[PDB]
Amino acid sequence: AYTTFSQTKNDQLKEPMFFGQPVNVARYDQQKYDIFEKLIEKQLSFFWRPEEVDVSRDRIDYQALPEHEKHIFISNLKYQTLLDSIQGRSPNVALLPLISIPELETWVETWAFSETIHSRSYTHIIRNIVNDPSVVFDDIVTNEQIQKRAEGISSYYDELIEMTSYWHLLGEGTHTVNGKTVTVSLRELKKKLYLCLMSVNALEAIRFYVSFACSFAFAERELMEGNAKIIRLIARDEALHLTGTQHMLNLLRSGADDPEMAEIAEECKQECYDLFVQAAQQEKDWADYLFRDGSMIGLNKDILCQYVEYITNIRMQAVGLDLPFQTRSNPIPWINTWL
Amino acid sequence: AYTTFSQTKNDQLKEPMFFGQPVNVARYDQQKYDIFEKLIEKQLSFFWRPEEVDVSRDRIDYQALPEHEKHIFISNLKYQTLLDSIQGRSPNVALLPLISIPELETWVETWAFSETIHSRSYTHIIRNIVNDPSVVFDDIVTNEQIQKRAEGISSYYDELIEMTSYWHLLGEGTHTVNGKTVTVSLRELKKKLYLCLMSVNALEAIRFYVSFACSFAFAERELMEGNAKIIRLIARDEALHLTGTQHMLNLLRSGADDPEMAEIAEECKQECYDLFVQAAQQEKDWADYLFRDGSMIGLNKDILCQYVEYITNIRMQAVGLDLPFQTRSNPIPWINTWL
Ligand SMILES: [Fe+3]
Ligand SMILES: [Fe+3]
Ligand SMILES: [Fe+3]
Ligand SMILES: [Fe+3]
Ligand SMILES: [Hg+2]
Ligand SMILES: [Hg+2]
Ligand SMILES: [Hg+2]
Ligand SMILES: [Hg+2]
Ligand SMILES: [Hg+2]
Ligand SMILES: [Hg+2]
Ligand SMILES: [Hg+2]
Ligand SMILES: [Hg+2]
Ligand SMILES: [Hg+2]
Ligand SMILES: [Hg+2]
Ligand SMILES: [Hg+2]
């Protein structure tokens, strides 16, 4: 099945990104796809430490905020914390067992590691703005609106992990387990990986960017500036993360890496399109919870729905999907200052 | 049955280190065991970029070494590369799916990430001292003596991963899989995890230190200074890695974590002892291959064997095991200069 060191001498430049021979030697002198080595290098060059960021005035700014604005700020922060709690562990548990080229294996571990720094930075902000961090952290697990917004993220990863385990343990075929038939299909597993990767692309390229707009709207008012510095560093990493999944996805659909993946991508076009639209819809719906007690200068439900549509169109076009929304200019040009 | 975001609001201070509820929120404001938070902080404080190290003179030094010394140097470097290729991926694929406290989850992902930096450093050295790095990397996979020295490392992680997949898919019990009766015992899986940790302790605390001694024998000669700087950085990280497994193991033994793990540590102590004795013998057996073309002043089979016994006793005492070897003073006190 899976092995931590395949003892067969293989040409790593000829393996597919996924489902080939597990990576044996970790070497970085050559790559099948140099984009992953470039991303590792850039991400290492961007290494930062959350505690090195001064967030000393954020507590008073937060206290002075009108209650509905405290609500907008903390709800957004809790969602960011939820997403990166998932992103810290999931690329490793879900992708590493399936990767067959070294540069992509190490990119995934570097990416996941950088997510743990993001999680540490959210703890740094939370500890410096509320008296008791535990209230904030526990609300993340059970918050109904947060889970509604992130609904389906852990399920894609979880289903891919389960199917990967069946494939590694039993291989392809029609099997039986305790009186039940269990069918294992590599094609279906490739489809699950493709859709999980598309979901991860929507997560980092759309969901987090909507959250960045919220955070930076405060920075525009010269408030929560410690948080702003941290989100700026996080967004700089996120740009690398979404670049990585865009390249994975485009290499999978072009047919240049795995012909079967190309057929899959085509067969999955409609499903993928609607999943992206569903993610956008979940982000829009979050607006009713976010602005339940009123809006803020530079940020309201309508400007956010417009930004969600703007960014979704850009991201979908980048991975070859049709645009679901009417084309428009960036509704919040000021955000470019921060990204 | 594994999930990337467990939906139950649990008190993370009361979960066992392993086999409890998978970690949902990644928070760092509190810890069941602060030693793992301190290790994360120390490892982040040591962050280093391999490519920045000047290895421009190592090529001149290496090409001018007598052939047998080239053999000693490169055989040692190839073994280091093998071990960290395994260490880069294995803590994430084998341990991460079993961790139930956030500070340990993030420590494992940071530890694994730091190992990919070690691998990157071996590529930096190799590509700058030989003309065809591929011959070196391919030999790591096919070299009989290198694989004999490492025998049992990958297979142990692999067996743990397989048993973990059966547990996550089927749960405890006696099952019928393709007409075969398969027993899934959580106690047996705990024993496998426990002994995997003991094996990883021997790997980083003994096997890598014997290799560091070989590398530093060249630094004592005022040669391979780029390599020397890198191995010094690697050893500083390795000290944190073995500290982490010593604490995981000693906390389990104490009975202050999962009580079943304290029972297992006592019941399995002869197996703990046996795996250290076997690893020490593999490290000694390597000397015949390492010095097949001749030895060096101050570095030969006898000296290597004395050091293996010396360091093995120190590491076994640190986790509560009886000493297999006669007591002796350090046979290579010059190594302290470098560590
Ligand atoms: Fe992130
Ligand atoms: Fe990210
Ligand atoms: Fe290492
Ligand atoms: Fe290590
Ligand atoms: Hg994914
Ligand atoms: Hg996913
Ligand atoms: Hg927002
Ligand atoms: Hg927003
Ligand atoms: Hg598609
Ligand atoms: Hg999609
Ligand atoms: Hg809209
Ligand atoms: Hg192990
Ligand atoms: Hg040695
Ligand atoms: Hg033991
Ligand atoms: Hg000896």
Side-chain angles (χ1 to χ4, degrees):
Chain A
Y2 174 80
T3 177
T4 53
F5 195 87
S6 51
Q7 277 185 67
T8 293
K9 173 184 198 174
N10 71 317
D11 185 348
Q12 297 178 327
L13 295 180
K14 291 178 166 53
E15 290 293 329
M17 282 183 292
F18 301 101
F19 308 108
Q21 180 177 319
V23 182
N24 42 41
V25 176
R27 62 185 288 191
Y28 308 91
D29 61 309
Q30 53 168 216
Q31 305 81 36
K32 181 180 193 186
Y33 300 120
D34 61 6
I35 184 64
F36 301 116
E37 170 57 27
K38 293 180 174 184
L39 289 170
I40 291 159
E41 291 173 19
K42 197 65 175 183
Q43 181 65 89
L44 296 177
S45 80
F46 286 168
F47 181 72
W48 55 280
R49 288 189 85 180
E51 50 298 318
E52 74 162 297
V53 177
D54 176 24
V55 295
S56 57
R57 210 195 81 202
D58 276 39
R59 180 182 294 281
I60 64 162
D61 287 356
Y62 182 73
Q63 289 287 161
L65 295 178
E67 184 60 35
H68 69 101
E69 284 184 30
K70 278 190 181 68
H71 178 70
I72 294 167
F73 182 79
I74 207 76
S75 301
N76 185 237
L77 185 52
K78 287 177 194 165
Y79 183 58
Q80 294 169 325
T81 301
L82 165 69
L83 294 185
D84 275 355
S85 286
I86 290 173
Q87 287 294 281
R89 66 188 61 100
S90 303
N92 281 330
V93 172
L95 307 178
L96 291 182
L98 298 174
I99 288 164
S100 38
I101 58 183
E103 65 274 28
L104 178 53
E105 186 187 64
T106 297
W107 170 239
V108 165
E109 302 194 79
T110 299
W111 169 21
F113 165 69
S114 74
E115 294 294 12
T116 71
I117 299 305
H118 295 180
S119 298
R120 294 179 62 78
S121 78
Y122 303 129
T123 282
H124 181 56
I125 292 160
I126 294 163
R127 299 179 79 171
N128 284 97
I129 67 166
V130 302
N131 295 323
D132 177 26
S134 290
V135 177
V136 176
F137 289 122
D138 291 324
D139 191 62
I140 292 169
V141 174
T142 60
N143 183 297
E144 242 167 47
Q145 293 80 17
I146 291 281
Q147 298 301 155
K148 171 183 169 63
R149 187 181 178 181
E151 188 186 344
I153 289 169
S154 63
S155 55
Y156 278 112
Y157 277 128
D158 291 355
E159 292 170 4
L160 172 63
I161 289 163
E162 181 175 300
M163 303 186 41
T164 297
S165 285
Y166 275 113
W167 179 63
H168 276 149
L169 289 180
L170 311 181
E172 284 198 87
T174 300
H175 304 110
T176 56
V177 175
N178 299 325
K180 289 189 180 191
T181 295
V182 174
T183 294
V184 174
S185 162
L186 176 56
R187 190 176 185 86
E188 290 300 299
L189 178 57
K190 285 184 178 186
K191 178 179 173 54
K192 288 299 298 178
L193 171 68
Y194 186 77
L195 290 180
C196 171
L197 288 177
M198 277 288 190
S199 298
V200 179
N201 183 263
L203 187 163
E204 296 188 305
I206 299 167
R207 304 181 184 275
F208 257 106
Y209 278 74
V210 171
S211 86
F212 298 152
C214 253
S215 301
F216 295 135
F218 287 95
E220 283 289 309
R221 304 170 55 191
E222 310 184 316
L223 298 174
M224 306 307 288
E225 306 190 300
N227 170 264
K229 292 177 196 171
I230 286 169
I231 304 305
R232 188 169 201 189
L233 291 162
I234 288 181
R236 185 179 68 175
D237 292 336
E238 197 75 280
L240 299 183
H241 302 174
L242 68 93
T243 295
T245 55
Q246 286 180 346
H247 282 259
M248 292 173 215
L249 289 164
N250 287 328
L251 289 168
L252 284 175
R253 82 177 158 86
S254 75
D257 197 67
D258 176 13
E260 177 167 42
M261 272 297 191
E263 297 177 18
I264 282 174
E266 188 55 47
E267 290 170 47
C268 284
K269 199 173 191 179
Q270 182 65 58
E271 186 175 351
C272 183
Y273 174 98
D274 295 315
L275 281 166
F276 262 104
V277 174
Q278 182 78 291
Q281 191 56 237
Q282 292 175 114
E283 296 301 321
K284 293 176 153 319
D285 292 342
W286 166 261
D288 284 44
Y289 177 64
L290 208 64
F291 310 104
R292 68 173 193 200
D293 338 290
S295 63
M296 181 171 78
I297 90 157
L299 194 97
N300 54 62
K301 153 111 136 56
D302 302 312
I303 190 78
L304 288 193
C305 285
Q306 296 268 42
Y307 189 59
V308 169
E309 285 183 9
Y310 170 72
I311 180 183
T312 298
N313 274 354
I314 287 165
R315 307 305 191 202
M316 289 178 73
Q317 183 165 69
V319 293
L321 298 163
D322 295 322
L323 307 186
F325 308 111
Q326 59 179 301
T327 300
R328 84 157 286 172
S329 192
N330 191 338
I332 51 170
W334 53 260
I335 201 168
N336 300 330
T337 292
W338 307 95
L339 299 177
Chain B
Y2 172 82
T3 180
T4 55
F5 197 85
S6 58
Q7 294 274 36
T8 300
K9 189 181 81 68
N10 72 320
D11 184 344
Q12 299 175 330
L13 300 177
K14 300 183 178 179
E15 293 289 329
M17 281 182 273
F18 300 95
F19 302 105
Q21 181 179 318
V23 180
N24 42 40
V25 54
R27 59 188 289 188
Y28 308 89
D29 59 310
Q30 58 172 209
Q31 301 86 40
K32 179 177 188 186
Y33 297 117
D34 61 11
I35 183 64
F36 301 115
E37 170 57 26
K38 295 176 171 197
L39 287 170
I40 293 160
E41 291 168 20
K42 255 299 208 238
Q43 183 64 89
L44 297 178
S45 85
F46 292 165
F47 185 93
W48 56 282
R49 182 66 182 270
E51 299 98 312
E52 291 176 5
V53 183
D54 189 0
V55 296
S56 65
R57 202 196 84 197
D58 283 42
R59 183 192 294 284
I60 295 167
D61 293 0
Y62 182 78
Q63 293 304 328
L65 291 170
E67 295 307 297
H68 67 109
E69 292 188 2
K70 280 186 174 69
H71 180 254
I72 292 166
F73 183 85
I74 209 73
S75 295
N76 184 57
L77 182 56
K78 284 187 275 195
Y79 180 66
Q80 294 172 325
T81 303
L82 171 60
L83 292 188
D84 274 357
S85 286
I86 292 172
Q87 290 293 279
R89 65 185 63 101
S90 300
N92 278 331
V93 297
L95 308 181
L96 179 61
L98 299 177
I99 292 163
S100 38
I101 57 177
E103 63 272 33
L104 181 56
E105 185 185 72
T106 298
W107 170 240
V108 167
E109 298 196 81
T110 299
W111 170 18
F113 164 74
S114 77
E115 301 290 15
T116 67
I117 294 299
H118 297 179
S119 298
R120 286 184 76 73
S121 84
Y122 304 133
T123 280
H124 182 55
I125 292 160
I126 295 169
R127 75 187 309 181
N128 284 105
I129 66 174
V130 303
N131 296 294
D132 185 16
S134 292
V135 172
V136 178
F137 294 122
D138 285 338
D139 190 60
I140 290 166
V141 181
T142 63
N143 189 304
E144 175 194 297
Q145 284 303 302
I146 289 177
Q147 296 299 153
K148 179 192 156 193
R149 183 178 176 188
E151 186 176 298
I153 293 173
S154 66
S155 68
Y156 213 88
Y157 278 127
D158 297 348
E159 287 157 4
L160 171 60
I161 290 163
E162 183 179 290
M163 291 177 53
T164 295
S165 290
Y166 272 114
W167 178 62
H168 278 153
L169 296 177
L170 311 185
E172 296 202 76
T174 303
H175 301 102
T176 303
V177 182
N178 289 335
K180 303 310 304 173
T181 300
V182 176
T183 303
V184 173
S185 163
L186 177 56
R187 187 174 183 90
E188 291 305 298
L189 174 58
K190 290 183 181 182
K191 287 176 180 175
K192 193 77 177 188
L193 179 281
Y194 178 77
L195 297 176
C196 173
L197 295 180
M198 274 283 175
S199 304
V200 176
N201 187 262
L203 187 167
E204 297 184 304
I206 295 168
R207 305 181 182 271
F208 255 111
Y209 279 73
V210 175
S211 293
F212 297 154
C214 279
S215 297
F216 293 130
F218 291 87
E220 284 278 298
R221 289 169 163 69
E222 297 174 26
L223 295 168
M224 309 304 295
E225 307 281 45
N227 175 84
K229 289 183 175 58
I230 285 169
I231 304 304
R232 291 194 91 207
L233 287 164
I234 289 178
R236 185 179 61 169
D237 291 337
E238 197 74 281
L240 298 185
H241 305 173
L242 71 90
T243 294
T245 54
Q246 285 180 173
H247 283 266
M248 293 173 214
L249 291 164
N250 287 165
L251 285 164
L252 293 178
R253 177 100 161 116
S254 74
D257 202 74
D258 180 357
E260 181 161 36
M261 281 299 198
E263 300 182 340
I264 285 170
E266 177 64 30
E267 292 172 22
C268 296
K269 68 188 177 172
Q270 185 63 46
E271 291 91 317
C272 296
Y273 183 97
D274 290 347
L275 71 88
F276 271 94
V277 166
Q278 160 79 305
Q281 188 62 54
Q282 288 172 294
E283 291 297 303
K284 292 176 170 183
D285 288 347
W286 165 253
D288 288 329
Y289 175 75
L290 185 69
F291 302 120
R292 75 141 140 73
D293 299 331
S295 58
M296 291 165 66
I297 294 287
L299 183 66
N300 52 48
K301 178 174 179 179
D302 202 87
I303 291 168
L304 181 147
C305 289
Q306 294 174 37
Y307 188 59
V308 166
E309 298 201 358
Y310 174 73
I311 197 61
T312 295
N313 271 8
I314 290 173
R315 303 308 192 198
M316 289 180 76
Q317 189 284 327
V319 292
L321 298 168
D322 289 335
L323 312 185
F325 301 116
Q326 196 54 51
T327 292
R328 63 171 57 254
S329 57
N330 194 342
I332 54 169
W334 49 261
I335 199 185
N336 291 153
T337 293
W338 307 94
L339 303 177

mmCIF file of all heavy atoms in Angstrom, chain B residues 189-209:
data_model
loop_
_atom_site.group_PDB
_atom_site.id
_atom_site.type_symbol
_atom_site.label_atom_id
_atom_site.label_comp_id
_atom_site.label_asym_id
_atom_site.label_seq_id
_atom_site.Cartn_x
_atom_site.Cartn_y
_atom_site.Cartn_z
ATOM 1 N N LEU B 189 -2.846 -1.143 18.823
ATOM 2 C CA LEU B 189 -2.460 0.034 18.049
ATOM 3 C C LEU B 189 -1.724 1.006 18.988
ATOM 4 O O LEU B 189 -0.732 1.646 18.574
ATOM 5 C CB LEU B 189 -3.699 0.662 17.429
ATOM 6 C CG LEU B 189 -3.476 1.995 16.704
ATOM 7 C CD1 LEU B 189 -2.440 1.854 15.567
ATOM 8 C CD2 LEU B 189 -4.842 2.448 16.112
ATOM 9 N N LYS B 190 -2.131 1.109 20.241
ATOM 10 C CA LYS B 190 -1.393 1.945 21.193
ATOM 11 C C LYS B 190 0.027 1.403 21.388
ATOM 12 O O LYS B 190 1.002 2.179 21.446
ATOM 13 C CB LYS B 190 -2.115 2.026 22.552
ATOM 14 C CG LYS B 190 -3.397 2.835 22.492
ATOM 15 C CD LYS B 190 -4.067 2.973 23.883
ATOM 16 C CE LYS B 190 -5.354 3.760 23.770
ATOM 17 N NZ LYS B 190 -5.954 3.905 25.155
ATOM 18 N N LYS B 191 0.194 0.083 21.464
ATOM 19 C CA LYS B 191 1.522 -0.496 21.608
ATOM 20 C C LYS B 191 2.377 -0.154 20.386
ATOM 21 O O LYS B 191 3.574 0.173 20.509
ATOM 22 C CB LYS B 191 1.461 -2.025 21.750
ATOM 23 C CG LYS B 191 0.946 -2.530 23.106
ATOM 24 C CD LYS B 191 0.849 -4.048 23.067
ATOM 25 C CE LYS B 191 0.341 -4.584 24.394
ATOM 26 N NZ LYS B 191 0.145 -6.069 24.295
ATOM 27 N N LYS B 192 1.791 -0.214 19.188
ATOM 28 C CA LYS B 192 2.524 0.087 17.964
ATOM 29 C C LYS B 192 2.970 1.538 17.931
ATOM 30 O O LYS B 192 4.131 1.837 17.588
ATOM 31 C CB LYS B 192 1.637 -0.265 16.758
ATOM 32 C CG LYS B 192 2.389 -0.299 15.441
ATOM 33 C CD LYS B 192 3.230 -1.578 15.261
ATOM 34 C CE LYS B 192 3.900 -1.609 13.893
ATOM 35 N NZ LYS B 192 4.564 -2.950 13.638
ATOM 36 N N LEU B 193 2.083 2.458 18.309
ATOM 37 C CA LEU B 193 2.438 3.881 18.367
ATOM 38 C C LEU B 193 3.546 4.094 19.399
ATOM 39 O O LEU B 193 4.562 4.799 19.133
ATOM 40 C CB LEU B 193 1.186 4.721 18.706
ATOM 41 C CG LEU B 193 1.291 6.245 18.850
ATOM 42 C CD1 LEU B 193 1.854 6.625 20.219
ATOM 43 C CD2 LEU B 193 2.122 6.847 17.753
ATOM 44 N N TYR B 194 3.392 3.493 20.570
ATOM 45 C CA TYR B 194 4.356 3.650 21.630
ATOM 46 C C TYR B 194 5.733 3.199 21.191
ATOM 47 O O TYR B 194 6.727 3.954 21.345
ATOM 48 C CB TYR B 194 3.884 2.845 22.841
ATOM 49 C CG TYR B 194 4.878 2.917 23.990
ATOM 50 C CD1 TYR B 194 4.966 4.055 24.804
ATOM 51 C CD2 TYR B 194 5.763 1.856 24.248
ATOM 52 C CE1 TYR B 194 5.916 4.124 25.835
ATOM 53 C CE2 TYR B 194 6.733 1.930 25.293
ATOM 54 C CZ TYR B 194 6.790 3.052 26.057
ATOM 55 O OH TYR B 194 7.743 3.116 27.064
ATOM 56 N N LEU B 195 5.839 2.008 20.617
ATOM 57 C CA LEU B 195 7.117 1.525 20.160
ATOM 58 C C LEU B 195 7.651 2.284 18.935
ATOM 59 O O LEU B 195 8.872 2.343 18.699
ATOM 60 C CB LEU B 195 7.104 0.012 19.902
ATOM 61 C CG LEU B 195 6.820 -0.833 21.167
ATOM 62 C CD1 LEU B 195 6.732 -2.305 20.802
ATOM 63 C CD2 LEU B 195 7.957 -0.605 22.196
ATOM 64 N N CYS B 196 6.745 2.853 18.131
ATOM 65 C CA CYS B 196 7.205 3.676 17.016
ATOM 66 C C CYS B 196 7.936 4.903 17.629
ATOM 67 O O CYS B 196 9.024 5.302 17.164
ATOM 68 C CB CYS B 196 6.001 4.136 16.180
ATOM 69 S SG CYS B 196 6.369 5.335 14.873
ATOM 70 N N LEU B 197 7.346 5.514 18.658
ATOM 71 C CA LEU B 197 7.996 6.654 19.314
ATOM 72 C C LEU B 197 9.363 6.266 19.881
ATOM 73 O O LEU B 197 10.325 7.005 19.718
ATOM 74 C CB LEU B 197 7.147 7.265 20.431
ATOM 75 C CG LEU B 197 5.848 7.909 19.946
ATOM 76 C CD1 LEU B 197 5.097 8.469 21.159
ATOM 77 C CD2 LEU B 197 6.118 8.998 18.900
ATOM 78 N N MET B 198 9.485 5.104 20.494
ATOM 79 C CA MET B 198 10.777 4.653 20.999
ATOM 80 C C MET B 198 11.753 4.500 19.842
ATOM 81 O O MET B 198 12.930 4.907 19.954
ATOM 82 C CB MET B 198 10.595 3.307 21.724
ATOM 83 C CG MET B 198 10.203 3.471 23.169
ATOM 84 S SD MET B 198 11.654 3.939 24.203
ATOM 85 C CE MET B 198 10.829 4.195 25.756
ATOM 86 N N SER B 199 11.297 3.975 18.708
ATOM 87 C CA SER B 199 12.163 3.794 17.567
ATOM 88 C C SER B 199 12.633 5.149 16.992
ATOM 89 O O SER B 199 13.798 5.329 16.575
ATOM 90 C CB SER B 199 11.447 3.007 16.470
ATOM 91 O OG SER B 199 10.982 1.751 16.973
ATOM 92 N N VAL B 200 11.732 6.123 16.982
ATOM 93 C CA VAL B 200 12.061 7.450 16.474
ATOM 94 C C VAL B 200 13.034 8.100 17.445
ATOM 95 O O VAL B 200 13.931 8.856 17.012
ATOM 96 C CB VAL B 200 10.803 8.322 16.320
ATOM 97 C CG1 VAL B 200 11.205 9.726 15.892
ATOM 98 C CG2 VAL B 200 9.836 7.665 15.334
ATOM 99 N N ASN B 201 12.889 7.804 18.741
ATOM 100 C CA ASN B 201 13.855 8.328 19.705
ATOM 101 C C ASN B 201 15.248 7.765 19.410
ATOM 102 O O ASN B 201 16.237 8.514 19.369
ATOM 103 C CB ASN B 201 13.434 7.995 21.135
ATOM 104 C CG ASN B 201 14.325 8.663 22.167
ATOM 105 O OD1 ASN B 201 15.252 8.037 22.686
ATOM 106 N ND2 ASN B 201 14.073 9.943 22.440
ATOM 107 N N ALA B 202 15.349 6.467 19.136
ATOM 108 C CA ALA B 202 16.647 5.909 18.787
ATOM 109 C C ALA B 202 17.184 6.485 17.495
ATOM 110 O O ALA B 202 18.402 6.734 17.359
ATOM 111 C CB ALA B 202 16.578 4.364 18.707
ATOM 112 N N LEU B 203 16.310 6.718 16.523
ATOM 113 C CA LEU B 203 16.735 7.274 15.252
ATOM 114 C C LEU B 203 17.377 8.644 15.394
ATOM 115 O O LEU B 203 18.521 8.881 14.935
ATOM 116 C CB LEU B 203 15.513 7.376 14.324
ATOM 117 C CG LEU B 203 15.665 7.790 12.850
ATOM 118 C CD1 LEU B 203 14.367 7.493 12.081
ATOM 119 C CD2 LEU B 203 16.008 9.308 12.700
ATOM 120 N N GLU B 204 16.670 9.562 16.029
ATOM 121 C CA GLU B 204 17.236 10.910 16.152
ATOM 122 C C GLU B 204 18.283 11.059 17.229
ATOM 123 O O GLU B 204 19.249 11.807 17.044
ATOM 124 C CB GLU B 204 16.121 11.897 16.381
ATOM 125 C CG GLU B 204 15.162 11.929 15.182
ATOM 126 C CD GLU B 204 14.078 12.990 15.320
ATOM 127 O OE1 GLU B 204 13.333 12.973 16.338
ATOM 128 O OE2 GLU B 204 13.987 13.852 14.391
ATOM 129 N N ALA B 205 18.184 10.297 18.311
ATOM 130 C CA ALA B 205 19.096 10.460 19.437
ATOM 131 C C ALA B 205 20.372 9.641 19.332
ATOM 132 O O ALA B 205 21.368 9.996 19.960
ATOM 133 C CB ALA B 205 18.358 10.144 20.738
ATOM 134 N N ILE B 206 20.360 8.569 18.541
ATOM 135 C CA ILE B 206 21.549 7.731 18.386
ATOM 136 C C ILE B 206 22.026 7.693 16.957
ATOM 137 O O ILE B 206 23.160 8.116 16.657
ATOM 138 C CB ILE B 206 21.283 6.259 18.854
ATOM 139 C CG1 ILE B 206 21.015 6.265 20.353
ATOM 140 C CG2 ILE B 206 22.502 5.375 18.563
ATOM 141 C CD1 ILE B 206 20.458 4.903 20.864
ATOM 142 N N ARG B 207 21.189 7.242 16.028
ATOM 143 C CA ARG B 207 21.661 7.086 14.660
ATOM 144 C C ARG B 207 22.168 8.395 14.089
ATOM 145 O O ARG B 207 23.234 8.428 13.452
ATOM 146 C CB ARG B 207 20.564 6.508 13.748
ATOM 147 C CG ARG B 207 19.962 5.196 14.241
ATOM 148 C CD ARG B 207 18.923 4.755 13.230
ATOM 149 N NE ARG B 207 18.187 3.522 13.556
ATOM 150 C CZ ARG B 207 18.593 2.297 13.204
ATOM 151 N NH1 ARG B 207 19.752 2.097 12.578
ATOM 152 N NH2 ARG B 207 17.745 1.271 13.328
ATOM 153 N N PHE B 208 21.439 9.490 14.280
ATOM 154 C CA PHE B 208 21.926 10.746 13.716
ATOM 155 C C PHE B 208 23.161 11.257 14.429
ATOM 156 O O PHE B 208 24.017 11.903 13.782
ATOM 157 C CB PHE B 208 20.811 11.794 13.708
ATOM 158 C CG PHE B 208 20.249 12.028 12.338
ATOM 159 C CD1 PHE B 208 18.953 11.622 12.001
ATOM 160 C CD2 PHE B 208 21.047 12.625 11.358
ATOM 161 C CE1 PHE B 208 18.461 11.818 10.695
ATOM 162 C CE2 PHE B 208 20.570 12.818 10.067
ATOM 163 C CZ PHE B 208 19.277 12.412 9.733
ATOM 164 N N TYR B 209 23.293 10.992 15.728
ATOM 165 C CA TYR B 209 24.496 11.479 16.406
ATOM 166 C C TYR B 209 25.742 10.703 15.960
ATOM 167 O O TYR B 209 26.824 11.303 15.873
ATOM 168 C CB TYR B 209 24.332 11.462 17.915
ATOM 169 C CG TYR B 209 23.567 12.648 18.391
ATOM 170 C CD1 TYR B 209 22.195 12.737 18.172
ATOM 171 C CD2 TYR B 209 24.215 13.761 18.932
ATOM 172 C CE1 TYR B 209 21.491 13.898 18.445
ATOM 173 C CE2 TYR B 209 23.520 14.941 19.230
ATOM 174 C CZ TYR B 209 22.142 15.008 18.973
ATOM 175 O OH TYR B 209 21.407 16.167 19.232
#
